[PDB]
């Protein structure tokens, strides 16, 4: 009555936010009785800490090697396209291809061994499509954000012809693409776009010997993901904290397990917390300021609170989230360097933002769950 | 949309059988939190949010106190194979006792709509009563609940009075073993597919190689190995070395050397989840660790349940394997080559394992079971 047993292969290419949006679907297939395996090129430990079995298909993956490949393929990319904001993922085809290249041989061998009935791959992992073609099975894409796929896979695959030849693979189209963002957040559709409730996953955690306690007054969260902090430095969040110090409201600062001392003396209305999953933190928060890290927009939506997207102004991948948040009105958009007290008072006080966030939360939770989506994919294939 | 509290008391095999259900609730969009003590880290390594409700928990201090305060128990029941969980009530209560204050506190902070607790976690029932919400029990093995919880609770009167709770009964009890393995039913017993969970794992840069011909697994759990020593394996390995078959030795990531040079037909493999090992395997010898009997059934292969002779909690699993004919039963010190030959070659064992696999697979999945709980209970 629940139908045949399947083997599902999940494929995640290196990149910010790529892996975690796959986790609910992976658990979804596993709890529905199917075999699940994840293929990654970096941080396989992260996938195994979600209770999953993982193969690292690129033992010799490295950023340094990626950049060398890009130089061999487009000697001008580094000091042209790579140095400016991005409008379309396809423009980055040469670099995304260099990222996917080290995964190809290991993934083809894995497909041959594992014989999956289905490949689920995150949007930047064109190797997942190649793997599906190798196996002769359907591929389902998972989007993490507002970026449209358009013709990116053709462009990416154009840099992998040697490997496609070697492995006797052609580039197929996915049978479905699972959005992270609800319809009203997107102006343009994916072909075969499916919508699914966003159920936050930021890793397991021992929270302590008790739940993190409810503050007197709900707090405004100030947060930045670890890799963003690594890229841009703690300085990126400093003017946000300074601006928060000038607002009559209470703030909670969540910079992971980073030593926050180089921020100097925190304003007395800003209190630091150690790491917990963001959804856990936002349970007790009135609004959130973030840097557009992986899953942040949708986790703030799950919380039903207004957000301020304030990436470092040097962040090149924020165009489409900026547009989604502004167009729907669930939040405000700035860069971290331009956040001031007036902007934060608008985040906290403008009821329109909260109304929209609430409406979009209702829209999002009326979408099929990951458990329902698994059943719908199983039906589709 | 619900807040679901999972409750796992310390003890062998208690936690992992909750994981498929925890993930099932979360992928259905519900909030999920796990209350545990001892290796809260393992729960977190399943991608779950965890509260350690007794961070000072020490099994040794717990048992020491039980023996001090319960001389008749310590000189009779504590030293012999268990026949029933209720006979160990004083001990089970002592394991639950240090979890109570923190779990009560957590129920008051989290306010669950539902409690799911493993069979030994009577504190889960008390927590459900505090919250004024339904409790669902999860069984890991063949043990029947019977009157265990009233017995356990009778040692927790001071805490129940302090916390103003009484002992409720579960609204449903979710079995690990399929109907044909069980001689006696639970009240409100629900059957569910066994979907193996042994922890996440980085397998390496490829799947394990498929051997030329399927192998016989020889396995033992990491706690079992630490409880009993690697001497609980040597006699099996010696017997294997005399059999015309290929064997695969899987002792976790444990030092193999205290065994010395293996026989030429026995190969050591580093740790993978057991279900992943058995994908290749024609039969399995194990020591009755958590999930083993059902993971062998999921693999559809005959098994030899050969625990260390000092293992006190194998009575009910031995009877289940024997009665149904899905495997052979022994003790690790009594396994010989003839017994291994029977495990491999006796067609009835293989037929029974296939049939019980088909029975088990026809049961609702964890996904479906979560849907029925929400539908029928909550």
Distance CA A209, CA B57 (A): 12
- Is B222 assigned a ligand-binding role in the annotation? yes
Q: Which residue's entry shows tokens 């002792």?
A: B251
Domains within chain A, CATH numbers bracketed = 1-207+366-381 (3.40.50.2000), 208-365 (3.40.50.2000)
At a CB cut-off of 8 Å and minimum separation 6, what does B235 contact?
B332, B333, B334, B335
Q: What residues 119-148 of chain B have any CB closer than 8 A to a CB of chain A?
A: none
Residue A245: CB atoms within 10 Å: 15
Distances B208 to A52, B74, B217, B266, B278 between C-alpha atoms, Å: 16, 46, 14, 16, 11
Chain A residues near residue B46 by CB distance under 8 angstroms: 50-51, 204
Query: Helices B16-27 & A370-380, crossing angle to 10 degrees?
Result: 80
Q: Cα separation of A341 and A231, whole Å?
A: 25
Nearest to B285 by CA among B239, B316, B323: B239
B8 exposed, middle or buried (CB, 10 Å; 0-12, 13-18, 19+)? buried
The experimental resolution of this structure, in angstroms, equals: 1.9
What is the C-alpha to C-alpha distance for residues A121 and A119, in angstroms, rounded to an integer? Answer: 6
Q: Which of B85, B89, B57 is nearest to B72 (CA)?
A: B89
b/e burial code for range A344-357 (CB count within 10 A of at least 16 → b): beebbeeeebbebb
**B49 CB within 8 Å of a chain A CB:** yes
Give the integer Cα–Cα distance in Å for A262 and A255: 12
Alpha-carbon distance of A171 to A25, in angstroms, equals 23
- What CA–CA distances, in Å, run from A196 to A176, A307, A372, A375? 12, 21, 9, 12
Chain B residues whose beta carbon lies within 8 Å of the beta carbon of residue A106 = 205-206
Question: 3-state secondary structure string, chain B?
Answer: CCEEEEECCCCCCCCHHHHHHHHHHHHCCCEEEEEECCCHHHHHCECCEEEECCCCCCHHHHHHHHHHHCHHHHHCHHHCCCCCCHHHHHHHHHHHHHHHHHHHHHHHHHCCCEEEEECCCHHHHHHHHHHCCCEEEECCCCCCCCCHHHHHHCCCHHHHHHCCCCCCCCCEEEECCCHHHCCCCCCCEEECCCCCCCCCEEEECCCCCCCCCCEEEEECCHHHHHHHCHHHCHHHHHHHCCCCCCEEEECCCCCCHHHCCCCCCEEECCCCCHHHHHCCEEEEEECCCCCHHHHHHHHCCCEEECCCCCCCCCHHHHHHHHHHCCEEECCHHHCCHHHHHHHHHCHHHHHHHHHHHHHHHCCCCHHHHHHHHHHHCC
Report residue A290 as tokens: 């973030």
Q: How many CB atoms lie within 10 A of CB A116?
A: 26
Q: Long-range contacts for B326-331 (Cβ within 8 Å, ≥24 apart)? A: B326/B181, B326/B296, B326/B297, B326/B302, B326/B352, B326/B353, B326/B356, B327/B293, B327/B296, B327/B302, B327/B303, B327/B352, B327/B353, B328/B302, B328/B303, B328/B304, B329/B304, B329/B305, B330/B304, B330/B305, B330/B306, B331/B306, B331/B307
Read off the tokens for B98: 């240090």
Task: Answer yes or no: do B201 and A374 touch at CB < 8 A.
Answer: no
CA–CA distance, B66 with A106 (Å, rounded to integer):
54
Integer CA distances (angstroms), A89 to A74, B57, B91, in order = 16, 52, 61
Cβ-count burial A144-164 (b if 16+ within 10 Å, e if not):
bbbbbbeebbebbbebbeebb
Q: Is B83 on the interface with A (CB under 8 A)?
A: no
Q: In the beta sheet, which residues pair with residue A139?
A: A119
The method of structure determination was X-ray
Instruction: Let me know: does B34 contact B9? Beta carbons within 8 Å.
Output: no
Q: CB contact, 8 Å: A199 with chain B?
A: yes
Q: A143 and A123 in contact (C-beta within 8 Å)?
A: yes
Q: Other C-beta atoms within 10 Å of B89: how many?
A: 22
Rg of chain A, C-alpha, whole Å: 21
Confirm if A363 and A183 have CB atoms less than 8 A apart.
yes
Task: State whether residue A56 sits within 8 Å of chain B by CB.
Answer: yes
Instruction: Give the distance from residue B107's alpha carbon to the nearest chain A alpha carbon, in angstroms.
Output: 10
Q: How many CB atoms lie within 10 A of CB A109?
A: 17
CA distance A305 to B192: 38
To the question of whether residue B274 is assigned a binding role by annotation, the answer is yes
What CA–CA distance (Å, rounded) separates A207 from B44? 9
């Amino acid at each position: 009555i629940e139908g045949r047993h399947m083997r599902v292969l999940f494929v995640s290419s290196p990149g910010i936010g790529h892996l975690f949006p796959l986790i609910q679907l992976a658990w979804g297939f596993r709890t529905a009785g199917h075999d699940v395996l994840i293929a990654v090129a970096e941080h396989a430990d992260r996938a195994a800490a979600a209770g999953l079995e993982v193969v690292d298909v690129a033992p010799d993956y490295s950023a340094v090697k990626v950049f060398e490949q890009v130089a061999k393929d487009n000697p001008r990319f580094a000091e042209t396209v790579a140095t400016r904001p991005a409008i379309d993922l396809e423009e980055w085809g040469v670099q995304i291809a260099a990222v996917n290249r080290p995964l190809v041989d290991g993934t083809m061998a894995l497909v041959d061994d594992y014989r999956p009935d289905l490949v689920v791959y995150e949007q930047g992992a064109t190797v997942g499509l190649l793997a599906a073609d190798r196996a002769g099975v359907p591929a389902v894409q998972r989007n993490q954000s507002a970026w449209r796929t358009r013709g990116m896979h053709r462009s990416i695959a154009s840099f992998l012809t040697d490997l496609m030849d070697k492995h006797q693979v052609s580039l197929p189209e996915p049978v479905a693409t699972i959005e992270s963002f609800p319809p009203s957040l997107l102006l343009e559709a994916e072909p075969e776009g499916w919508f699914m409730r966003w159920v936050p996953y930021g890793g397991g955690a021992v929270l302590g010997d008790r739940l993190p306690p409810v503050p007197a007054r709900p707090e405004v969260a100030i947060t930045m993901g670890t890799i963003e902090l690594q890229a841009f430095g703690i300085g990126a969040v400093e003017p946000i904290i300074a601006a928060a110090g000038e607002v009559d409201a209470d703030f909670v600062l969540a910079l992971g397990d980073l030593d926050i001392s180089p921020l100097g003396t925190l304003p007395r209305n800003v209190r630091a917390v150690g790491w917990t999953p963001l959804h856990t933190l936002l349970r007790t928060c009135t609004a959130v300021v973030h840097h557009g890290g992986g899953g942040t927009v949708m986790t703030a939506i799950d919380a039903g609170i207004p957000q301020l997207l304030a990436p470092d102004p040097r962040d090149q991948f924020q165009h489409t989230a900026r547009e989604a948040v502004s167009r729907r009105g669930i939040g405000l958009v700035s860069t971290s360097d331009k956040v001031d007290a007036d902007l934060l008072r608008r985040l906290i006080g403008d009821e329109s933002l909260r109304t929209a966030a609430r409406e979009v939360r209702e829209e999002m939770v009326a979408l099929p769950t990951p458990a329902e989506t698994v059943r719908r994919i199983v039906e589709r294939i």
